Amino acid sequence: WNTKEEAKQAFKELLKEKRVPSNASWEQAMKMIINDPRYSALAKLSEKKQAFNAYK
Numbered sequence: 001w002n003t004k005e006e007a008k009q010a011f012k013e014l015l016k017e018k019r020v021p022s023n024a025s026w027e028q029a030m031k032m033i034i035n036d037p038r039y040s041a042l043a044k045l046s047e048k049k050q051a052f053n054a055y056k
Contacts, residue, residue: 001044007051010041026056 001007011033018032030049033039042048049056 001051004047004051004053007042007045007048008054010038011052011055014038014042026052029055 001010014033014036015029017038018029018036020029020032024032030052033042045051
């Protein structure tokens with residue numbers, strides 16, 4: 001990801017793929033993402049969590 005906004009895009013997309021409950025916590029959503037094999041897409045970014053300031 002070139003910018004944090006691109007990580008944010010993938011974040012929301014994975015939230016849709018994992019049907020993350022609207023009442024789910026940010027940390028819980030992260031856990032559901034980890035379960036997704038596409039997690040590595042976000043893990044690659046050393047500022048993964050720092051890019052999710054719009055969600056945390």
